[PDB]
Structures are given as C-alpha cells and as structure tokens.
Amino acid sequence: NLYFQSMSRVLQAEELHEKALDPFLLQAEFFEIPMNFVDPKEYDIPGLVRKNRYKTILPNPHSRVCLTSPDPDDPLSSYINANYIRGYGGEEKVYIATQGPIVSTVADFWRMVWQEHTPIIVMITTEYWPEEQVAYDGVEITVQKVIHTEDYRLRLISLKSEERGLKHYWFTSWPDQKTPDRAPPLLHLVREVEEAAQQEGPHCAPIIVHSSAGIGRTGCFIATSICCQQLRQEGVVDILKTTCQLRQDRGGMIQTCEQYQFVHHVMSLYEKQLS
C-alpha cells in the first residue's frame, strides 16, 4: 500500500464468469484504481527528453531499473524507462515493464538485458534486434533461429561477452476488439512464456515485457500471467488486487477498461479450460 491503498476482490469461478460479462461493474471498479503516474518534474535530468517515447509516461522512481554500468552515479547514463514488477504473491522482480525501444534507447535496452541476465523478452505490437548479428557495449547479439507460429514469432538469441541465451517472443496478434473470441492467442502466449520461464530453473532473472508505452498491453500480459498462477495455486483470481500491485510498481499498468475486461475474458476462459 505504498502510494495508495490496494483493493481486493477475490473471484471464485462463478463470479469470475459473470464479472467478465458485466461492463458496468468492470468500469466502476476499474476507475476506482489510481493510475499512479509520476509527476514529470520528479526527473530533472538534462538529455532525458531523448529517452522517453511519451513525456508524461515515466517510471516510478522507487521501482525504476537503474543502469549501473558504465556510470551508475550519472543520472542520464543510469536512466531507462523501465520498472521492476512484482509477480504472483508479491515475488520481487519477476518482470521488468518497459517502453518499446526507440532509436536513442536501443543500446540502453541491451545494457538492461545484460545487467539483469534477462532470459526472456515479451514484445507486444524500432527493430532493436539484428537480422543476423550486431554488437553493443561489448556484447555480441546473434539471432540464431526464427520460429514462426500463428500468433507470435520466437527468436532464439545468443548474447556473448561469457555466453548467454535469450528467447524473444514477438506477439503480433494484439486484437483491435477485446472480445472473448480474441482471448485464446493471449492465453496461449502467457502459458508458453510460463513454461519457458520454468525451464530457466531456480532463481529466474527478470522477464522483460514491452509495448509502445510499456503500460497498457504490457500490463494486460503481466496481470494475466500473475492471475494464471493464482488460479492454478489458489483456485481463485484477484484481478483487482493484481492490478493495484502493478500500478504501485509502474503507473498506468492496464490503461483502458476494455483491456481490464479483456483480462477477465482471458481468465474466465482459462478457468473453463482448467475445470
């Protein structure tokens, strides 16, 4: 309850299915949740203008990812528009939510990937990866394989500087209409990424998730991911509490009520699948 009082509504299956189909209640509930955006004046850093895609969408200071190499004491060098995000049950640093890299932040993005030992990137739609190979700040980035599926493209990537693997999931099927029939692809991606995460073994490093601003579709993906574990482990989902937790970590996570309803559609579907 750092910036604001968290709210909760624990949904068992019956209520979950009905809740997903009550837009009047969904909007009432959603617009009670503070956005928790940071005042841009909190950052007074020359050159910061080049680092943000949107001037009013900035990382909450307490959870921002600081880039500690090569100049941790320089505000601009240490800056990236990205926040550590708690996962299911409040587990620290399960994800990093960040804006889609822009021309001026591609190298910064890779600095973060290397710093955090990130095993997986989830991209939801600048092409910041090479066609074959490119090097930033001492780390050689090689795309070893491209795997095309119905709804995403998966790149298997080598990072060498010490060699590490990286899985890059590019989800292209973000629906214009957030209707129940559009839920399955997002659910499938969420479950694929869960499996990939588990395959990394103990003490998994943060999973990077991005979209243009890194709040709306990024928030939907992460909320759904968290709630899937909750459903399997507890037999309930608390989308309201999860959304509150996300907002405490990064202002604006889940931007629209249509997105909020979509998360309910996805969870209702998953409950049916599990049942």
Which one-letter amino acid corresponds to residue 94? V
> How would you list the strands of the sheet with 152-160, edge to edge?
82-85, 95-99, 207-211, 120-124, 163-171, 152-160, 139-148, 133-136
Torsion of CA 243, 268, 205, 124, to 10 degrees: -80
Parse the chain into domains and list their residue ranges: 1-275
- Residue 130 makes CB contacts below 8 A (sequence gap 6+) with 141, 142, 143
Rounded to whole angstroms, what are the CA distances from 202 to 102, 180, 227?
33, 35, 21
1-275 fold: Protein-Tyrosine Phosphatase; Chain A (3.90.190)
**3-state SS record for the chain:** CCCCCCCCCCECHHHHHHHCCCHHHHHHHHCCCCCCCCCHHHCCCCCHHHHCCCCCCCCCHHHECCCCCCCCCCCCCCCCCEEEECCHHHCCCCEEEEECCCHHHHHHHHHHHHHHCCCEEEEECCCCCCCCEEEECCEEEEEEEEEECCCEEEEEEEEECCEEEEEEEEECCCCCCCCHHHHHHHHHHHHHHHHHHHHCCCCCCCEEEEECCCCHHHHHHHHHHHHHHHHHHHCCECHHHHHHHHHHHCCCCCCCHHHHHHHHHHHHHHHHHHC
Any bridge partners for residue 135, and if so which?
140
Method for this entry = X-ray
User: What is the resolution of the experimental data for this entry, in Å?
Assistant: 1.7
In the block, which residue shows the tokens 């590490």? 164
Burial class of residue 104 in the structure, from the number of CB atoms within 10 Å of its CB (0-12 exposed, 13-18 middle, 19+ buried): middle
